[PDB]
């Protein structure tokens, strides 16, 4: 495994960048879904026709 030293260094940049992208994606998803998540329905039965 002659690439062992360089492979482990490159894995440190991947995980840090990908962990911060995953967390930033949860916030963006929750911001776009706020209107649907907090939505209220009421029902007034219509009078007979």
């Amino acid at each position: 495994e002659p690439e062992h030293d360089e492979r482990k260094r490159l894995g440190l940049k991947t995980v840090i960048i990908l962990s911060s992208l995953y967390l930033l994606s949860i916030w963006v998803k929750k911001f776009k879904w706020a209107g649907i998540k907090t939505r209220k329905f009421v029902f007034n039965p219509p009078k007979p026709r």
């Binding site: 990908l18 930033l24 911001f31």
Partner: protein, 62 residues
């Protein structure tokens, strides 16, 4: 219940609703996404393109 009576949204609303402050906050979180994604796309296209350059054994016979 009249349809003119809106339900209670108090426990999900911001208590200070500023347009400029509340927009700069949201755009700064999508800019951070677009900054890191643009950085990760550069490292992806460079990885594939560079594999098409001269290999180690070929470079030894220069």
């Amino acid at each position: 219940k009249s349809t003119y009576r809106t339900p209670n949204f108090d426990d999900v609303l911001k208590e200070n609703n500023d347009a400029d402050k509340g927009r700069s906050y949201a755009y700064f979180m999508v800019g951070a996404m677009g900054l890191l994604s643009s950085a990760g796309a550069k490292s992806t296209v460079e990885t594939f393109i560079s594999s098409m350059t001269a290999t180690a054994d070929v470079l030894a016979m220069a």
